[PDB]
Design a binder for this molecule. Structure first.
Ligand SMILES: [Mg+2]
Lengths: 445, 142
């Protein structure tokens, strides 16, 4: 959902703002890589010709088999307003945006760029020792403060404010603490590339009055920069933006020159495993991971018992699962984490069981489960235990003078989808507190 | 004598294929033909009873034929102390390696022609019954 998320945000932006956004070649190049492969093919054809092509011609290129992909491509391009459909002389002519066409032309042909990609100071620093360590630690710190594990250096107010108001890491003053939510666990599950965009996308919505295009302009060219290089300093809004960028471990400053980091390059949709753990019948967890971040996330629903340098060993318990469920983590998410962080050995034995299953009877092909089904059943059963009681808040209706009135009132509540339960014998029905006013309003009417 | 006769019939006769045993046969009994086991209710928190009873069907003669899997069931009433006992007594098998599967519902059970205490009248009759549970000369005269 990376290209979907970035693309969807661009669509919501008004066309008037999009035109100004396409001014810099850098952002146009980044936006070009987001469109579907067919869209890029048409765009490249149209960038280098200052003419008008009728719509039907582009359709002729697409084969009959790939006709479906044509509909998606044209729809995506039109929504971003990159392609301007002009109708005249009885034909629906097609043309490319003049600003976008010029922007792409300069980048490819090396025309005047107005320092969109930045400048080089020729003062490089060691990437492995400094850039990797700084961003890794800074990104590590924010993650720890999100998973709830104690950490000395808490994040700054800027990122702290962003996390709270967003769905991530819901906080309550009365509780006096911060805890993860259903979306928060998904955020942790998402790979680093999608993990970074979620925070950046939320920040883009947080900024107010700072221009929306300027923030988008800075973010796009940041990926264009190459790690381990200097870049001298930019818009006035981009200045405070650059300092705020340091809070997320994307750019490093000594105190005039800013250095992009691995995360900065990774932003622009760049193309045994650590975290693998063994889940077995005895509800014992053996995670072959050596990293506090992996340990912290595991503790959300695993009762850790001890840790070695090479791995951490723990046990799944009813208390541990309930703790995660209470916060808002769903069981389906938990199994996804277990399945996606499986040990290679588990797959082989599961495949061996499948091979024997096929040998005895090859007529059945069920989706293979890396971890034993018993763990799945118990975890889901515990979820059912927490959902044992279902309660709704609202009001009750009784003592209707006429049966027709009761039916009329009940029927309307069903129409507006606020009727929860009803009994014809007792002439009673219960409605949700949310739709209590609507039912009462209809009663008066 | 009687139990042996029942045991012999259950083994060598095709007519009878099921028996209802008790704690008597919980240990050191050889039943090669036994493959399926059902435990409606048993001895509280005892663990060895669960394992030893499971050993009866581990004796299956046809334990090498392809696709053979002995069946071991433990019917437990929901929302009852039996769950506390049941989870405690099977704590030894899990250590050995056997894993227990939860069966919330048996497919095709409703289509069975007849079931015990299906009508409410029969159920109430059971409820009341279970609730109600707690001189040689003189000899000739006569
Ligand atoms: Mg013996």
């Amino acid at each position: 959902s990376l290209k979907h998320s970035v693309t969807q945000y661009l669509e919501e932006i008004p066309q008037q703002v999009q035109n100004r956004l396409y001014t810099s070649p850098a952002t146009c190049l980044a936006i070009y890589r987001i469109l579907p492969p067919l869209a890029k093919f048409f765009i490249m054809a149209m960038v280098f010709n200052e003419n008008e092509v009728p719509l039907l011609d582009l359709d002729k290129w697409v084969n009959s088999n790939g006709k479906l992909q044509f509909q998606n491509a044209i729809k995506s391009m039109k929504s971003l307003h990159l392609l301007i459909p002009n109708k005249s002389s009885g034909t629906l002519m097609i043309n490319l945006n003049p600003t976008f066409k010029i922007s792409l032309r300069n980048a490819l042909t090396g025309g005047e760029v107005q320092n969109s990609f930045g400048v080089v100071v020729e003062e490089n620093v060691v990437s492995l020792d400094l850039l990797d360590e700084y961003s890794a630690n800074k990104w590590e710190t924010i993650l720890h403060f999100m998973v709830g594990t104690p950490l000395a250096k808490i994040p700054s107010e800027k990122v702290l404010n962003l996390l709270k108001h967003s769905k991530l890491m819901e906080e309550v003053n009365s509780t006096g603490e911060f805890k993860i939510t259903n979306e928060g666990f998904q955020f942790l599950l998402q790979e680093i590339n999608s993990q970074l965009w979620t925070l950046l996308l939320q920040y883009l919505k947080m900024i107010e009055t700072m221009d929306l295009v300027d923030v988008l302009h800075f973010i796009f060219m940041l990926g264009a920069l190459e790690v381990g290089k200097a870049y001298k300093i930019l818009s006035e809004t981009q200045r405070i933006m650059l300092q705020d960028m340091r809070d997320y471990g994307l750019v490093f400053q000594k105190h005039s020159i800013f250095y992009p980091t691995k995360l900065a390059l990774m932003l622009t949709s760049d193309t045994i495993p650590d975290g693998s753990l063994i889940v077995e019948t005895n509800f014992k967890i053996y995670s072959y991971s050596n990293s506090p971040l992996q340990i912290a996330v595991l503790s959300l629903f695993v009762h850790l018992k001890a840790r070695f340098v090479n791995m951490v060993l723990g046990q799944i318990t009813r208390e541990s699962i309930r703790r995660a469920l209470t916060n808002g983590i769903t069981a389906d998410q938990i199994i996804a984490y277990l399945e996606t962080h499986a040990h290679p050995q588990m797959r082989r034995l599961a495949e061996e069981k499948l091979e024997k299953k096929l040998e005895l009877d090859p007529n059945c092909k069920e989706p293979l489960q890396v971890l034993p089904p018993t763990v799945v059943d118990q975890i889901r059963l515990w979820q059912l235990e927490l959902d044992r009681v279902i309660t709704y808040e609202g009001s009750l209706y009784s003592d209707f003078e006429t049966s027709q009135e009761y039916n009329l009132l009940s029927k309307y509540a069903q129409d507006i989808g606020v009727l929860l339960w009803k009994d014809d014998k007792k002439k009673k029905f219960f409605i949700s507190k949310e739709g209590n006013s609507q039912v009462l309003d209809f009663a008066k009417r | 004598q009687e139990r042996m006769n029942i045991l012999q019939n259950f083994q060598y006769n095709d007519q009878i294929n099921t028996i209802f045993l008790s704690k008597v046969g919980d240990t050191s009994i050889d039943l090669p033909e036994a493959t399926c086991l059902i435990q409606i209710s048993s001895h509280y928190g005892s663990r060895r009873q669960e394992a030893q009873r499971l050993g009866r069907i581990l004796r299956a003669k046809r334990r090498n034929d392809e696709g053979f899997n002995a069946f071991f069931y433990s019917l437990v009433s929901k929302d009852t102390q039996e769950m506390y006992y049941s989870t405690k007594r099977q704590a030894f098998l899990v250590d050995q390696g056997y894993a227990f599967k939860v069966i919330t519902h048996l497919h095709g059970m409703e289509n069975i022609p007849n079931l015990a205490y299906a009508s409410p009248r029969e159920r109430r009759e059971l409820l009341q019954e279970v609730l109600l549970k707690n001189h040689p000369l003189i000899r000739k005269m006569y």
